[PDB]
Structure formats: structure tokens, C-alpha cells
Amino acid sequence: EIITLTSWLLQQEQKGIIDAELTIVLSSISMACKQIASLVQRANISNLEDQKKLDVISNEVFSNCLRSSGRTGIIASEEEDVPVAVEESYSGNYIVVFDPLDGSSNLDAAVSTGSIFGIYSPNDECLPDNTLGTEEQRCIVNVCQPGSNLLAAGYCMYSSSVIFVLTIGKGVFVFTLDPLYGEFVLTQENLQIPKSGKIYSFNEGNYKLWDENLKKYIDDLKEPGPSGKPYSARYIGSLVGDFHRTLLYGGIYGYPRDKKSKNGKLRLLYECAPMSFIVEQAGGKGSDGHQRVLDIQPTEIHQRVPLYIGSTEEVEKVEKYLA
Amino acid sequence: KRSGYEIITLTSWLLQQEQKGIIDAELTIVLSSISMACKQIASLVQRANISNLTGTEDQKKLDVISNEVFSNCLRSSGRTGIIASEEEDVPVAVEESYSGNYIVVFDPLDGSSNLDAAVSTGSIFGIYSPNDECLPNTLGTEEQRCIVNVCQPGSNLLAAGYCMYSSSVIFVLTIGKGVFVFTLDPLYGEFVLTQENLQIPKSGKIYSFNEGNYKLWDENLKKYIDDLKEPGPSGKPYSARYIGSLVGDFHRTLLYGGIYGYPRDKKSKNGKLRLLYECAPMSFIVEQAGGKGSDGHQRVLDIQPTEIHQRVPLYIGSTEEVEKVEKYLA
Amino acid sequence: YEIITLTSWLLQQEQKGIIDAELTIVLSSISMACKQIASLVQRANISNLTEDQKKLDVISNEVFSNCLRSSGRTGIIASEEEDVPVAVEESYSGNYIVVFDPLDGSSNLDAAVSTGSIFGIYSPNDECLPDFDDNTLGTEEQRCIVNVCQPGSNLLAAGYCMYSSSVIFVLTIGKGVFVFTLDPLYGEFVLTQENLQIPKSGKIYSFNEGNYKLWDENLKKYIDDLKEPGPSGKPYSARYIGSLVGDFHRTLLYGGIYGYPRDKKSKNGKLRLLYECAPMSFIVEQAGGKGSDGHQRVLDIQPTEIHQRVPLYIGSTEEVEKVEKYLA
Amino acid sequence: EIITLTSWLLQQEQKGIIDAELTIVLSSISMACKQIASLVQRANISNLTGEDQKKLDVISNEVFSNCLRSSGRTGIIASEEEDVPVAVEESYSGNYIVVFDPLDGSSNLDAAVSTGSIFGIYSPNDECLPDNTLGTEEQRCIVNVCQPGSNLLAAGYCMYSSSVIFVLTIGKGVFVFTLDPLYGEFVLTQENLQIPKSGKIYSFNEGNYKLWDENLKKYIDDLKEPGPSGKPYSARYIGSLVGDFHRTLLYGGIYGYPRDKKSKNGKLRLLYECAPMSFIVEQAGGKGSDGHQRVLDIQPTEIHQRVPLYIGSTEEVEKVEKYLA
């Protein structure tokens, strides 16, 4: 028996785990993700080619699809960051923080990309260019607190298959978009990432930019077990793709700080938090090298942190080296 | 609608090529049936989590249905046999034209590993103009020995391509005169020409190797990887990208430049990739785009296949990156 | 609110308390069966020899049963003649009964360009089916169902899904007529018109005039008079697909009048009262039009026989009233 | 899928039944039609600033132009009247001219359930081509060079209804392809279609009865007589020329668009609508007449020439001809 995402969501709304309002939000998010998938797939055809330009259109489809729930503002990127869409329910009960695509690099989107989203229960209203100023950004950062009011997080990966991964806070559920019917079909319940995994995913091209602690860590992954097999290295360049592969097969994915990016590249609130919340629901761990990501409260407008994420035993191992 | 633009489907594009007499009507039908098989393989890849919730290494079973899809789609052209997978290799389909004018060597999927097909995978094919017949559905030893003497990458390889199944479905084709890029239009069910005469950059600061094997490599290879990491005077080292999907990793290289490597190591003494099925069609595509395909010493396309599942190290990509690697291994 | 899907619109009706969560799911499940029936109707030539409208009626009823499995059990009222077999779902809670016409006919001719499903949702006072062809309901379950579903008093919602050049889901939960268009790219029904109102007049008449020599003298005159060009010199336009859903949908949108009257051969009309006439009359009235049997309001008639039939005159209020004057 | 349109085209080209050039053209047409099918299905959604049959006529002509731009230049014949603007493509080579009706009407009422694109491909004896409106003299050239009676090589339609069906004849019988909504490909579903020889179905706008000639009035009134069989003819009339025609093709019967007090010479246009459909019907074993003569015998002289049309099952059409004589 095939359960669609919509049926599953109406069942959760029927058992009262989620409200009607929240149900609407999730269902609209998944309708935006189907439209973005189609943009991503036809991009070569549509351009007759920038991942940055796609970033923008995707924010507009998001806005349209969540317009019946609330207003959407845009946190513009003056760096190489994706522009972030922030939706605020007309009601005040929910704020949705949406990364349309997971990078702005063509190179890193060659084979995969994905949207990332986090839904919060705010205690203040922040939304008044579609761009948000510094003041609205400050408000967002103070009201969205991953370690205390993050209710639901998910991603949609656009790659050889289109995969919607959700967690309202009870386990992780995987939904696969069926291309024949255009519906997201439940294909995995209570996904669990393995405890251990001999796969590491880092951009080893930056090794000479890393602290001595990390280098040793990396150098030892290449030592063959008594079994004679060293770790396997996989690194797509796509945050969702690489996260997704880790979540399923285990291992460790890392975006360390380096000599050029002194506090790392990933943003605490927009990228690291929704993914750390997912990996914890699946049984894994998200850390910055020393601390649990979701224990870091967001305090500043463009706060970045290093991220080590994946199988619990792989992440604990990195932290011993960095300690 | 707006101003206007030209949408060339693959069919029209093949009919143009026939009209110019670059290719035959027969070849036209083969290349077109190959692309229909890829369109159906693309749908099977996309729905695999759903169809595994019934039926109607999961990457292994997909390998096998793909090969049936390929036989069924080329049935008006020839008969298809299968070269059974050796170890964890993908079974290879071999079709021979009823006319005896062509042989297609089709690798349904680029691996049998789930890890490596997590985000992308793809079909690889080679079309040869044989001197004999090798069947005119497992191919046995005799048929496998015939295929190897008749299919010569250095001389009768007329056309080579791949179809990548990733966030887009891309069909990359060369018929001997430049590399052409078709994008599958999911709305309309056709491939549309979206790039002509692709050229791979002459250089590119991107390397793609599985560095987890670094301690299993030779010291000359290790020195080359180590230097790539040195920040030049601008302070930028090379970037590392390794999907683990040969088609995915190759496609990225072809578009943005750089180097892809699958070396031999203490465990795979002759590399992993197979010469005839994987390296040869890919080297032919790269040379038509302006790059190089080497085994670390020699031009892959100058190596005569003499043993079915023969393997070779592969260094493919940007002309100067490849040259630089062969300088460290000499 | 720019793009409102059917799931979101339903959840907003539930939030405003117009509907129940139970009904929300019954509705959303009906629409999924309609999505899959659409795809069957579209691919029907392929699925035979990449073709009978009769066979599609059967698979359509099984898709409906599968789609409504979590809400209740489904049985089938076997078709008397050339009538479509009707699926009947009884929610496990006893609160709702869904009466579903899978397709609007059993003829290929009449389904050459369009067909559609029709449903009515009733709030029952008793339990009919029980347990689980299986599907076929016996005489006794059938009578229960005809006794429990009373168009004039417990008919809560009704709709249809038309399968034509576009796929259109039309629904009324008691407060206006809402139109959802299937977005084939994204597999979802999207709100494309709210509170539809059928025009009060429209110079369009839809009847099978091959039957003219079989009709009664009062109706022949009415037909004959539509053909008189007026002072404007423009007589009425005749349109008649032969798809009940197609013809009704055109009528709802552009106005005019659709009729399937009694004749010498079919002494009481062809359309069934409960399965076809009632859901459509409730929709037309929610759009501000009229549904009559020529002398009386269809939803005032109580279904008393299993396959009871009635003549139907439906469409723009002024158009129905005019045929009603000629038949008095 | 089983035999697809693209496979079937490439075999015909390979049997030398059609050029490569013409195979490109036919292929581009079916692409345009799969995009138009899409526009038609999603019109209600598109029209929410993100409905008029006339707007869609326009967009469909631009789709057609982009899909055929590789084969030749596209120009538009407008009728500021109630006719669909017609796109006319002329190969760059000068070997072919396609005349394409994007949709079969500009009325919303008549497009309520179905609509369709209609095309004829001609092998011209001169070049006519130079915001693609053709001027008068380009229109006059098209009309003298497209001669349904002698150089009309291939005709077809694509119906947009509950099914999307591409009907094509290249001069050897009529082939029916169904669009597969799962896979996006047109699949061959019917080879050598033959319209039945008779059919007790008549398709006319009978609202106009009091405006038809006395000869036509009695033919209408006779179809309503039950034979000794007790069954009169069945009336069906969608209002969509493609849909009414397609049902007649498959199930037999007759379709008519007669002349009347208002439309002295009928409403359908000879070259854009009547000719291509007459060619198809003939290939399927039926008849296409103006009530007195074979449609494809009439040579077009005027830009927007209209003709009464009676088409369908040979016996039914002969039967009407008998009452009009």
C-alpha cells in the first residue's frame, strides 16, 4: 500500500501531532519543492546558466506557494551564500526558514542540489526590494532558536531521484517523488543512520589550510584496518547530496574551519541547524568539533560554524582529535 | 511566449547529420533507439525506491533490468547478448546489427554500488564497425573473445556517448566530429540539444580521485596529489570533488575542466575501470572535446584490448592536467 | 494566497469548522482516486494495444475502493442495464456514506472526448454494508443505501471530476461551488475559481435531438421555439457532447440548459435520480441555477427504487423555468 | 513504449517513403503539439496571473514557430474576424510549406472539453516568404502555391481532450498515435484506420435549423425517423471541429457545417480547415464534400475562402448529397 506525503500529513494532522496550519505549511513546502525540482531538471533548456539565478527563481516559487500562509522576506547574500527565504505566518505561530538551493556554485550543483528548511514557533513578529534589512534579520536570529523552538526540519534533494526528507520531531521520514504521477511517496519510515561508517566526506584540497589536529585525523583515515581497507572518500560538493549519502550509508561529512574561512563556511542557522536536527532524529550526531550544534544559540546576523556530521562513532572520533 | 528560440530535438538532430551524410540511416536508428533506452533507464533510476516497495545491492538488479530495456529497444536493429559481470562489475550488453554493420557495447549503469549511485549514475556506450560477426543470452568465452578482436577503440570506434542520470538527465554524444549535449525535457519526453561542440578547458584546478586509497598508491602518484594541495601564489590550492560515479565525475570534468583519476593501487594492480567498456568510449569523448585520456603513460586509445575484462588505470580530463600527471609518473 | 492546492483549501475549510477532519480525508482521498482515473482514461488506448468504457468503469471502482480504504469499506451496486456500476463507501465510523459514479457512461461514443466521475456525500442515520466481487451489494444492502441517502436532507457535499482537455475537480461542501484544475506537471489540484455562479440565462440548449420524434408534444414545441431567431436574429446554439459531466460542466460555466427527458422508449428518463441527478442538482443550486424534472425540484424527490430514473432539466435558472412553462 | 511516433517516423524515412527533411518537419510538429497539449491542460492555472481561447491561439503559434525554426521561417495569416490566426511555415530549402491551425476555434464555449491543432504540408512550386504577419501579397502567394488537389503531401491533427491523439496520414492510410502521459511519447495505437461506411450519428449545430435551405431541412427531419428498427439517428455535436471530426472518423456518421442565411458560404475555411480534414477522411475510406462536389477538387482563390462541409462515412455523405441535388 502506497502512502503519499499528503495522506501521511493528513494522518499526522488527524492524530493531532500537527495542527491544520502546520499541515498547510508542509504541504505548500512540498508543492514548492516539486516546482523547484522541475526548474533544476530543465535548467539547460530554460537558459537557451547560473546556479545563482536559479536560487532567485526558486525563492519566488517558494513565496507564491506559501503566500496563503504568510509573508515571505529575503535575506540577501552579499557573500557567495544562497539568498534565504524567510516566511512568517499571518497568524504568528510559525516562521519557515528556507534555503532554496544548497549553493551558488555551478560546479557544486553539477549532479545534485537541494532545498533546506526549518520551521520555528516564534515569540515575536519580524516581518513588516523583498529584501530584509539588518533589523529584520536581527529579529529572525533572536526568535529562531534551534535548541528550543525548532519544530520541524527537512530537505528536498534534487538528483537522480527527488527525495523529500522530513522530521516533525518524531523520527525521520523519506518520501520519493514518483515521476509517473507527480506525487511524493513514503518510501522509508524512521530512517536510522548507521552508528559507524568508513566513508569520509571533506574537500581534501584544503588540507594545507587545516589545523594540525585535523590533518592527523585525515591522515589516519587512510590507514588500512587489520582488514586492510582504509576509509573511502566521497565528496560531491553539494551539501544536501553529501548529507543525504551520509544519512543513508553512514560516515562523516565535514566542513572545517581553515586558514581562509576562520569560522567555517556553513551558516549556523540556515544550514547547520536543520541538518543537525535531522541527523539526531535519525540517530547520528552534528557537532562543531567540540560542541553539539543545537546547543549553540544563534547570536549574530551571519554566524558561521564548522560542521562535523554523521554516524555518532565517526563524529566522536573526530572530536577526540580536535580536543 | 517571448521573442523566439530554436529547440532541436535529438531526432531532428540525427536526421540533420544523416542528411549531411556524416552518418547512415541505420546508425540514425541505432543512436535513436539507444536514447530511448536511456529515457527508460532514467525513469527506472528515478523510481527505484518506489518500485522496490514491490517490483511492478539494488543497483545490481537495476543493472540487469536496464540491460533488458536496452535489448528490447534495439530489437529492430540487432540481437543483444550479455557479458556476465565478473566480480562486482556491471554486466555489459553487446548488441550486433542484423546487417553486421555495427556493434554497440553498452554499460547500463556506471557501478553496482549503492553508495556510489546515491546521487548520480549513467549509461556508457560505444558503437563499432566490426570486421567479423560474433553471434550472427549470456555471451560465452568464444563470443567474448570474438568481441575483443573485432572492437578496436583505436580504429573502428565510430561513435561514443553516455547518458547521465542526475538532477538532470543528459545525453552526451560524439559521432566523430565534436561533442554534443542533449538535455532530456521531462515535460515533453525528448532530449533537446542544449550544447554544441563542447570543449573541455585546457586546464582546471579540480582533481577527482578517491584519496582514501592514498596509502595504497605508488610514491610518484602520492607526490602529485600532495603538490595539488599546495596553495599557489594566489593562495588557492586545487579543489577536490569525487562523486564516486564515473559518469557524474566525468561529466563535471568535461564541463568545468580538471582531472579524474582511477589509478592502480596495491589491491587493484591494474586499476578498476575496464578498458573496452568504460575507458575507451570516455577517452574518445574527451579527445573530441579537446582533452586527454591516458593510462598514466600512454594514450588509452592506443592500447589494444586483448582480454575481455582487461582493466587499466585512467587519468582523464584537461590536457595540461593529464600531462602534468604523466610527468610525475614517468 | 496565490497557489492554493486542494489539500490546503480543504484544511482551511476544516480550520473554519465548515468540515471535519474525517471529511477532509474523505475528500482528499476522492480526489486522489480521480487523479488516478484521469491517467487511466488518458492512457486507455495504450493499455489495450499501445478499449471499452465498460471495463474502465470497473477498474475505476477498484481504484476508488483502494483510495478510500483508510476511511471505510466499499461495495458495488451492480448496474441494471447499460448503466455504470456505482461504488458505495461506508466510513468505518458510520458518519459518512460516499456514493461514487466512476465514469459518466458506458458508451465509447459518448466518451470520445470527455468523461467524468460524480460523487455525493451523505450523513447517514444507519449502517448498511457490513463486511466483505465481494463488492456487489445484495438487494438488502442496496435498499438500505437508497433509504439512508436522502438528497434533500442529508446530502452534505457533492462534486465531479471531469476528464477532458483539462482535468477539473468541481466541489461544493454546502457553501458555493469551487473549481480546482489538475496541474499535470505537479500532480496536484489547484484552486482556479471560487464561488462559481452559473449565468441566469444562456442561449445554449443541450439535448439529443435525434430523439425529437420520440418526445412529447409539449417538448417538441419548446425545442422548435429555441430555433426561432429573435429580434436579434440569433437563435439558440445547440451543443451536446453526450458526456453528462462534459455537457453539465459547459452548462455550469457558460450557462444555458441541458436536458435528458423522458421519451417513448425511456418512459422515465435515463439518468438515475440518486446516482446522477441528485449530486448535479445540488451543485447547480449551489451555483445559483436550477435542477428540475420538468415539473418539480429534483432534490425534493425521494429516491424510492434502487435504479429509479428521472427526466432532468438543469442549467441556468431562467432557462429551466422556460422549459417548465412549456411542460406545464 | 511499444512503437513510438519517433520510431515509426524513422522507419518511414528508412523505407524511403518520406525524406529526412520531411521527417524533421513531422517530428518538430509532434513536439509543438506536446507543448500545446500542455498549454491547453494548464490554461486555468496559467490564467491566474501566473481565460481566452484567443490568447492561447497566439501562444500556440509561437510554440509552433520555435519548434519549426530549424526547418524554416514562420509567418502568420491573421483574420481580424473570428478565425484563428494560421501559422505558415516555409522550409528554408523551399521544398515544403506547412499550414498550421494552432487550435480549432477561438470560442471558449466550443473549447470547453476539447480542441486540437490541424496541419497540411504542401510541396510548393514557388517561394512566398521574406510580429510575423504576412502582408496581402505573401498571403496571396501562399494561396496559389498550396493546392489541396495536387501538392498536399501530408495532413493531420492533434486532438487535445480526455486523450491527446495525433492523427497523421502521409499519403498511405491514416495512423493514430496516443500521447502516453506517463512517458511523454506518442505511441502508435492504430494503423490504417478506416472510418465505417455508414453510421447513424449526425453532427450538426441544429440550433441553426430555421436558417438552413429547404433541402437541408428535410434531410435533418428524415434522420429523426426511427426505421422499422425503431431507432432514429443519434445526434452529437461538441462544437469542436477536431473533436467532432475525430469521433466521426472513429465511429462513423456524418459531420456537417452547412451554409445558412448568415453564413452564405459556410463557416469553415477551405484551405486551413476543410482541405486537411478531407485528405484524412479520404485516406480513411470516407468522403469530404461541399454538399455537391469533392472538397479537394475545389481550388482556393481567396485568402479566407469558406465552404460548406459535409464529411464522414461515404454512405452518409452520399445520402446528404442526394437531398441537396
Q: Identify whether residues C165 and C294 lie together within a single domain.
A: no
Closest C-alpha to A277, from A113, A101, A144: A144
- The three grid cell numbers given for residue C67, joined into one nine-digit string: 483510495
CB contact under 8 A, C166 and D44: yes
**Distance between CA C323 and CA C291 in Å, rounded?**
12
Q: Which of B4, B12, B187 has the CB atom closest to D184's CB atom?
A: B187
φ and ψ of D105, to 5 deg = -170, 170
Q: Which of C185, C209, C241 has the CB atom closest to D113's CB atom?
A: C241
Closest C-alpha to C170, from C30, C1, C20: C30
Residue A1 to residues B47, C36, C63, C89, D36, Cα–Cα distance (Å): 16, 15, 12, 19, 35
In C, minimum Cα distance to A72 occurs at C1
Closest C-alpha to A154, from A141, A137, A169: A169
Distance (Å) from the alpha carbon of B200 to chain D's nearest alpha carbon: 27
Residue that finishes a domain, picked among B172, B197, B222: B197
Residue ranges of the binding site of B for Mg(2+): 57, 86, 107, 109-110, 278
Q: Under 8 Å CB-to-CB from D60, ≥6 apart: which residues?
A: D32, D36, D39, D102, D103, D117
φ and ψ of A161, to 5 deg = -140, 165
**Distance between CA D66 and CA B5 in Å, rounded?**
5
Say which CATH number the domain at A275 has: 3.40.190.80
**Distance between CA B259 and CA D165 in Å, rounded?**
49
Say which CATH number the domain at D96 has: 3.30.540.10
Closest C-alpha to D119, from D135, D96, D139, D95: D96
**Distance between CA B132 and CA B114 in Å, rounded?**
38
In C, minimum Cα distance to A66 occurs at C1
Residue that finishes a domain, picked among A172, A190, A208: A190
Instruction: Supply the residues of C annotated as catalytic.
Output: 52, 57, 80-81, 101, 103-104, 276
Instruction: Supply the residues of B annotated as catalytic.
Output: 58, 63, 86-87, 107, 109-110, 278
CB contact under 8 A, A27 and C12: no
Q: Identify whether residues D173 and D201 lie together within a single domain.
A: no
Q: Identify whether residues C126 and C266 lie together within a single domain.
A: no
Q: DSSP assignment, residue A231? A: -
Write the DSSP string, A192-209: ---S--SEEE--GGGGGG
Question: In this structure, what is the dihedral angle of CA atoms A18, A19, A22, A27, given to the nearest 10 degrees?
Answer: 80
φ and ψ of B206, to 5 deg = -140, 120
Residue ranges of the binding site of D for Mg(2+): 51, 80, 101, 103-104, 273
- How far does CA B123 lie from the centroid of its chain? 7
φ and ψ of D248, to 5 deg = -55, -45
Please return the burial class of D188, using the count of CB atoms within 10 Å of its CB with bins 0-12, 13-18 and 19+: buried
Question: In this structure, what is the dihedral angle of CA atoms A160, A162, A168, A171, given to the nearest 10 degrees?
Answer: -40
Instruction: Return the number of CB contacts < 8 Å for C and D.
Output: 187
Note whether A254 and A202 are within 8 A (CB): yes
- How far does CA B228 lie from the centroid of its chain? 26
| Biggest alpha carbon–alpha carbon distance for chain D | 62
**Distance between CA C189 and CA A137 in Å, rounded?**
35
Q: Identify whether residues A236 and A103 lie together within a single domain.
A: no
**Distance between CA D32 and CA D25 in Å, rounded?**
11
| Reduced 3-state DSSP string for chain C | CCCCEHHHHHHHHHHCCCCCHHHHHHHHHHHHHHHHHHHHHHHHHHHHHCCCHHHHHHHHHHHHHHHCCCCEEEEEECCCCCCCCEEEEEECCCCCEEEEECCCCCCCHHHCCCEEEEEEEECCCCCCCCCCCCCECCHHHHHHHHHHCCHHHHEEEEEEEEECCCEEEEEECCCCEEEEEEECCCCEEEEEEEEECCCCCCCEEECCHHHHHHCCHHHHHHHHHHCCCCCCCCCCEECECCCHHHHHHHHHHHCCEEEECCCCCCECECCEHHHHHHHHHHHHHHCCCEEECCCCEHHHCCCCCCCCECCEEEECHHHHHHHHHHHC
At residue C175, what is the residue type?
A: K
**Distance between CA B234 and CA B256 in Å, rounded?**
20
Closest C-alpha to B293, from B264, B325, B269, B255: B325
Question: In this structure, what is the dihedral angle of CA atoms B190, B193, B199, B201, given to the nearest 10 degrees?
Answer: -70
At residue B270, what is the residue type?
A: N
The sheet carrying A70-75 orders its strands as A70-75, A84-89, A95-99, A113-120, A150-158, A162-167, A172-178, A183-191
- The three grid cell numbers given for residue A184, joined into one nine-digit string: 511524493
Q: Identify whether residues B203 and B185 lie together within a single domain.
A: no
- What b/e readout covers B84-105, taking b as 16+ CB neighbours within 10 angstroms? eeeeebbbbbbbbbeeebbbbb
Q: Identify whether residues D177 and D237 lie together within a single domain.
A: no
Residue C12 to residues A70, C9, C97, Cα–Cα distance (Å): 14, 5, 23
Q: Identify whether residues B228 and B159 lie together within a single domain.
A: no
Note whether B165 and B243 are within 8 A (CB): no
Q: Which of B53, B194, B213 has the CB atom closest to A187's CB atom?
A: B53
Distance (Å) from the alpha carbon of C47 to chain D's nearest alpha carbon: 10
Rg over alpha carbons for chain D, rounded to the nearest Å, is: 19
Q: Identify whether residues D128 and D234 lie together within a single domain.
A: no
Map grid coordinates 483539462 to a residue: C166
- The three grid cell numbers given for residue D159, joined into one nine-digit string: 486532438
Q: Under 8 Å CB-to-CB from C271, ≥6 apart: which residues?
A: C244, C260, C277, C309, C310, C312
Q: Say what the resolution is, in angstroms.
A: 2.2
- How far does CA B125 lie from the centroid of its chain? 6
**In which element (H, E) is residue A134 found?**
helix A134-143
At residue C305, what is the residue type?
A: E
CB contact under 8 A, B6 and D66: yes
Closest C-alpha to C128, from C112, C114, C139: C139
φ and ψ of C292, to 5 deg = -120, 165
φ and ψ of C167, to 5 deg = -110, 120
- The three grid cell numbers given for residue B38, joined into one nine-digit string: 536511456
Residue that finishes a domain, picked among A158, A190, A222: A190
Rg over alpha carbons for chain A, rounded to the nearest Å, is: 19
Beta bridge partners of A96: A87, A119
Q: DSSP assignment, residue A148? A: T
In C, minimum Cα distance to A62 occurs at C3
Q: At B164, is the secondary structure helix, strand, or coil?
A: strand
Residue D268 to residues A20, A290, C139, D101, D105, Cα–Cα distance (Å): 54, 80, 54, 12, 10
Residue C100 is part of which domain span? Answer: 1-195
Closest C-alpha to C236, from C321, C113, C319: C319
Distance (Å) from the alpha carbon of C12 to chain A's nearest alpha carbon: 8
What count of Cα atoms within 13 Å lies in the side-chain half-sphere of residue D64? Answer: 30
In D, minimum Cα distance to C251 occurs at D109
| Reduced 3-state DSSP string for chain D | CCCEHHHHHHHHHHCCCCCHHHHHHHHHHHHHHHHHHHHHHHHHHHCCCCCCHHHHHHHHHHHHHHHHCCCEEEEEECCCCCCCCEEEEEECCCCCEEEEECCCCCCCCCCCCCEEEEEEEECCCCCCCCCCECCHHHHHHHHHHCCCCCCEEEEEEEEECCCEEEEEECCCCEEEEEECCCCCCEEEEEEEECCCCCCCEEECCHHHHHHCCHHHHHHHHHHCCCCCCCCCCEECECCCHHHHHHHHHHHCCEEEECCCCCCCCCCCEHHHHHHHHHHHHHHCCCEEECCCCEHHHCCCCCCCCECCEEEECHHHHHHHHHHHC
This entry's atomic model was obtained through X-ray
Q: At A3, is the secondary structure helix, strand, or coil?
A: coil
Q: DSSP assignment, residue B71? A: H
**Distance between CA C57 and CA C76 in Å, rounded?**
11
Q: Identify whether residues B31 and B169 lie together within a single domain.
A: yes
* Axis-axis angle for helices B10-19, D5-14 (nearest 10): 10
- Is beta strand A199-201 parallel, antiparallel or unpaired with respect to A252-255? parallel
The tally of domains found in chain D comes to: 2
**Distance between CA B257 and CA B235 in Å, rounded?**
20
Q: Identify whether residues A25 and A93 lie together within a single domain.
A: yes
Note whether D307 and D295 are within 8 A (CB): yes
Note whether A238 and A294 are within 8 A (CB): no
Q: Identify whether residues A99 and A156 lie together within a single domain.
A: yes
Q: Which of D1, D207, D224 has the CB atom closest to C238's CB atom?
A: D207
Q: At A59, is the secondary structure helix, strand, or coil?
A: helix
**Distance between CA C243 and CA C193 in Å, rounded?**
22
**Distance between CA B230 and CA B240 in Å, rounded?**
13
Q: Identify whether residues A254 and A297 lie together within a single domain.
A: yes
Instruction: Return the number of CB contacts < 8 Å for A and B.
Output: 181
- Is beta strand C188-196 parallel, antiparallel or unpaired with respect to C177-183? antiparallel
